[PDB]
Paper text:
A current model for signal transduction is that ligand-bound Fzd recruits the cytosolic protein Dishevelled (Dvl), which then binds to Axin and thereby recruits the destruction complex to the activated receptor complex. The Dvl-Axin interaction is essential for Wnt/β-catenin signal transduction and is mediated by a [name] (Dvl and Axin interacting) domain present in each protein. Dvl has an N-terminal [name] domain, as well as a PDZ and a DEP domain; the DEP domain mediates the interaction with Fzd. We found that purified Dvl [name] in solution forms antiparallel, double-stranded filaments whose stability depends on the inter-strand interactions in the double helix.
We obtained a cryo-electron microscopy (cryo-EM) map of the [name] filaments with a global resolution of 3.6 Å, which enabled a near atomic resolution structure. Remarkably, unlike the single stranded fibers observed in crystals of [name] [name] domains, in solution the [name] [name] filament forms an antiparallel double helix. Successive protomers in the filament are related by a rotation of 48.0 ± 0.2° around the helical axis, with a rise of 13.5 ± 0.3 Å per protomer. The pitch of the helix is 101.3 Å, larger than the pitch of the single stranded helix observed in crystals of [name] Y27D (85 Å) and Y27W/C80S (88 Å). The head-to-tail interface within each strand is similar to that observed in crystal structures. For example, Y27 packs against F56 and K68 of a neighboring protomer. We next tested the role of the inter-strand contacts that form the antiparallel double helix. These contacts are formed between two opposing protomers, principally by the β3-β4 (residues 60–66) and β4-β5 (residues 82–84) loops. Some residues on the β3-β4 loop (e.g., D63) participate in intra- and inter-strand interactions, whereas others appear to be involved solely in inter-strand contacts, including M60, G65 and N82. The structural, biochemical and signaling data indicate that the double stranded [name] filament is stabilized by inter-strand, antiparallel contacts that are functionally important.
Author numbering:
A (entry chain C), B (entry chain D), C (entry chain E), D (entry chain F), E (entry chain K), F (entry chain L), ...: 13 to 90
């Protein structure tokens, strides 16, 4: 069970979704299906870059795994 | 007796439902039955996260316990 | 005499009913009888919550008193 | 002479009947006589409330005066 | 002492300021002196009109009085 | 002094503006100079048509007079 | 000991200050003496109004007490 | 595969986009298409100048290559 | 060994200091002894408030313990 | 092609703009158009003075040529 | 051979020092012996933290190794 | 012939010394044989780093070459 916490563009408080798969094969398409967003949103994900530190990488490929930032998938929308 | 408070997407004022069960076994399906919403709504629930603080976690499993935030179930819809 | 003002779902102008009982024993069933609504409506009532402010609490128990919001029972339907 | 305008439930155009009494002692039962409605209708009357503005108060007592909203009794039925 | 409550444009929770004058002769310039708005703001005030009910009237003259809507000056900004 | 009541697109409560000219020569551009709208708005004014009853007519000429409705300029925006 | 949580203008995460006096006699100037703000700031405080619910009331008198909203002095700056 | 780390004007954390082309033919229009920016933004790019050192050169031509600063396209927006 | 990461006023990248005491009994005065700040600075520390989430609480007593936010003392200066 | 390097007031890293005109007719107005600055800024330019060495001369005339300091237009803003 | 680039307090251009030992066992006291600073300075070294990204960590033990951030020991003084 | 422009600690006017060897094999000890500095001074030389831009690298080996920054050996003392 992964608690994928995400945000949106203007709302100040973050959200959370319980995702039924563990944190070794969780992809973008599993997180995208349980949100029911109307159009194509920008799915940023908080990852650790070896050159710049914390980065919010946009993922648009549904086969790409989610970056488990300290075992807690922090995401963003729009 | 639990006084669950829920909002909606666009309306500015919160709601309230008196729920006859106490605050140790209240689930989503008890709250979902007394609302009589037409379609599948996004049932967010204000919960305290150990990493980010106040989060609004979406609950879809009807067996899940509601996260009573300081003894006051704050909720959100749509 | 209590002037319980109520609204409906889509109509922008509010209604009003003169109710012959005073504001210490007025319940849901006294207000529900003089309206002659065809089916089960959502009887919201504007109340003052000490944690979130103004709330529109749904009352479905006919023994429950109506929340006298500053001596003026503001209500909602559907 | 009072030109009481009244509406009905579904039809969009308003009617207009004449009541021979002036606008200080016109009652509900005087207005109820010239309408020849078959059953008990909901006689709403457009009145000015000091807390919410324009309200449509249902009058069911035949001794109650009609609210002269700017000298023009706007009414509603059903 | 007047509890003149004012809103802003996008902020949903309202403010409150105290004025040292009573409610009988409170002007806009007394309310304009405890705010210090950075630009020329639109000072709407909740008033009761005899033809339309609750209106939010714009007051621009600093010597003009404020409408005590039920003994509570409700205002709006921008 | 004219009380030009104007509504907006989605807001339910109407506004009010005191205008320093009388009702005999009040124009749209005089009413437009006191609102300072951010873009070109649709200024629908409540008028009385002799074939269809009450109408909300668009006025775009800034020197065009405003149709009073029983001595009260009712307007609409957007 | 009181936990007087306060926000700032643009900063989204809130602050916290322990104040050595209890909640029964805590004043603004006691809270003002522990921040040492570089200019005259606007000290809004979350209070409960009996007509509008939660309000952020501005307090400027240094001897005026602070509204203990549910035993927690929430505040705002600028 | 190139990981184009970029920033914006006010946000403190950098972003990242995975770009499916390698680092010998990547242009500005390839990076501009996957961002879906609303208007014409200032596309600065971190480059090594032999006279002044690290510079952030604005690129507006879509045929121009991106400066591979140590094999990592660091960029800026607005 | 504690890694007390701390920020400054305008500098966006954070610092880090090692403290020879463990995290269970670390005080402000031990953290204040490895900095040698030129004046009295504001020592905000990231803590978890049970009513508002993450807060930056100011600690001024040198014998007061530091809030181990997820086993990591995050701090701020001035 | 001229690669004009410019700085700003507080940012430590220099910028760069490619300019499609050569270094014999480049003026201030050609450089000012491609920057899209909001207000009137101080456009300093590095030039070699015969009495004081390197100087940053302010140019405000759009007909004035840019001083090609060793074939490299070094500039400054604000 | 290591290129230990370091900065100072007010000087914006960075320095560089060739150190005769490799990057596997380079310590602070080896780097401290080649500068001969006139007083005890703060040796902030750019390191990669797994919870916040890039950090400027302070090293005070002369036998403590230096964090080779991407094979380049970036440092700071005072 | 080389024009090795160099500075001192507090003097803002740079010096210039001629060295009878060309730029291809100019060493520090050849530059050290022209100045005759009264003590062991720090010989920083303006070089181009491929990760940080312009740097002032300290050279202490007398047989080590000097970095020809754009064909002009800019140096520093103490």
């Amino acid at each position: 069970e992964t608690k994928v916490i995400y945000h949106l563009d203007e709302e100040e408080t973050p959200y959370l979704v319980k995702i039924p798969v563990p944190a070794e094969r969780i992809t973008l398409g599993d997180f995208k299906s349980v949100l029911q967003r109307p159009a194509g949103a920008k799915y940023f994900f908080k990852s650790m870059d070896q050159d710049f530190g914390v980065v919010k990488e946009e993922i648009s490929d549904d086969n790409a795994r989610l970056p488990c930032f300290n075992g807690r998938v922090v995401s963003w929308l729009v």
